[PDB]
């Protein structure tokens, strides 16, 4: 499914002209400020919910469980612990 240089197995390409410049001719950090601020904000915003939703949910679940556990092993939580065991 993948070949090697010369016969990589791309469907025939025609009509794409690719241009690039030398690494020595380019500023490697051109527009780094713009990218670091605006591009990273864009990419972060677009992915934020995919991280925030499960982290916030499982942090809530952990928080509730750890608070209950703490409370069960207090004097006030004696009775509820006795029922749990």
């Amino acid at each position: 499914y993948m070949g090697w240089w010369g016969h990589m197995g791309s469907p025939p390409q025609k009509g794409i002209a690719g241009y690039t410049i030398s690494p020595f001719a380019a500023r490697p950090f051109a527009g780094v400020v713009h990218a670091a601020i605006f591009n990273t904000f864009r990419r972060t915003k677009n992915q934020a919910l995919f991280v925030i939703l499960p982290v916030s949910f499982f942090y809530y679940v952990w928080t509730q469980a750890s608070e209950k556990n703490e409370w069960l092993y207090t004097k006030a939580g004696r009775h509820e612990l006795a029922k749990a065991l």
Partner: protein, 383 residues
């Protein structure tokens, strides 16, 4: 024709590290493969070095590790480097398996490197564990007891296998010396399998974060990914340095600095941070055999991802619903990790069971269902 292509030996190296055609758009999550290679090299170097100083006899093992810390020049470094890299190895390998699950690297045509990978993951667990036992501190001895008793789950012959693996009636000198032999051996087996899964991958080439073919646009492995992999080498070494030099014991259990006492097990039994997810799984199930099966199945079930992912699209970049499901799966695997280290108390007993069910239901129910529905949403949604 270039020597690197002409000469059979160079040609094999060339095909892996120099001319290897890679997709041009691999992101930083493709760097874990080389970090795991670097971890494996560090572990071999520090490991073989510790083996030059360590004594496998149970009467001397713990003391030889103290001698390494105290008397051997740079012994502290070599020991902590070995111990900490074992932790980094697992961060990197979960990252690498994470990457593979998120981007559908397990799908055809890469089921073989994936499946060999699942075995590398099991071997790493057994290697790292066998290595944990060699210290012969309190956790070491107890860990040995439990792992060697997982075969007691196997009915009838089980109990006899346990005694055979201990070479005794309990974990003792015999066990420690055979763990040393095998802990030295297992990493070379693991490097074979690591190589094999690359050879299996070389038929299809790396996947890429879009999950499309990269046959249209390839880049030589060097210089592009060689230099890309250095960034993570140095980022890894920065994190390595912070642990090894500044906080070498953050990732460790205090109890392993107590010599093994077969008469007590510590009241706070908590295994290595990386085994915690499966340990919570083992705790969750209240049956002996059940608990063991579930724990092993939690790794072996990765083998079925090629089947149960019914998507026509490779990986999750373009599947909002699958990405959310994957987020919950990952967070649940971290929750299992957390529950592995709390006390076995309410309410975490029930919670650990719910997380265990969710872990398995991702492979058995949710992934097959979500992937089916998203297929339909792509087709309907684009008409």
């Amino acid at each position: 024709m270039a020597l690197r292509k002409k000469n059979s030996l160079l040609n094999m190296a060339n095909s892996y590290v120099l001319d290897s055609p890679q997709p041009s758009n691999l992101n930083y999550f493709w760097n874990f493969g080389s970090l795991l290679a670097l971890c494996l090299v560090i572990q071999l170097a520090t490991g073989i070095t510790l083996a030059m100083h360590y004594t496998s006899h149970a009467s001397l093992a713990f003391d030889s590790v103290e001698h390494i810390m105290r008397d051997v020049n740079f012994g502290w470094f070599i020991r902590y480097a070995h111990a900490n890299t074992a932790s980094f190895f697992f961060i990197c390998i979960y990252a690498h398996m994470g990457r593979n699950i998120y981007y559908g690297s397990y799908k055809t045509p890469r089921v073989l490197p994936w499946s060999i990978g699942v075995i590398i993951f099991l071997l790493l667990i057994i290697t790292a564990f066998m290595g944990y036992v060699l210290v012969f501190g309190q956790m070491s001895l107890w860990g040995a007891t439990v792992i060697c008793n997982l075969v007691s789950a196997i009915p009838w012959l089980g109990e006899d296998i346990v005694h055979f693996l201990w070479g005794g009636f309990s974990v003792g000198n015999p066990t420690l010396q055979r763990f040393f032999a095998l802990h030295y051996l297992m990493p070379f087996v693991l490097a074979v399998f690591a190589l094999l899964h690359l050879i299996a991958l070389h038929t299809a080439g790396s996947s890429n974060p879009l999950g499309i073919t990269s046959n249209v646009d390839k880049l030589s492995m060097h210089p592009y990914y060689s230099f890309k992999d250095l960034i993570t080498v140095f980022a890894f070494l920065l994190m390595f340095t912070l642990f090894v030099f500044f906080s070498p014991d953050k990732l460790g259990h205090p109890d392993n600095y107590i010599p093994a006492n077969p008469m007590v097990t510590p009241a706070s039994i908590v295994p290595e941070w990386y085994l915690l997810p499966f340990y919570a799984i083992l705790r969750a199930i209240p049956d002996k055999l059940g608990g063991v099966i579930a724990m092993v199945a939690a790794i072996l079930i990765l083998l079925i991802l090629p089947i149960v992912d019914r998507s026509i699209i490779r990986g999750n970049a373009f599947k909002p619903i699958s990405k959310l499901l994957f987020g919950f799966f990952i967070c649940n695997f971290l929750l299992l990790g957390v529950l592995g280290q709390v006390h076995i108390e309410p309410p975490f007993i029930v919670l650990g069971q719910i997380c265990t069910i969710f872990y398995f239901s991702y492979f058995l129910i949710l992934l097959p269902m979500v992937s089916t529905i998203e297929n339909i949403f792509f087709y309907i949604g684009s008409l």
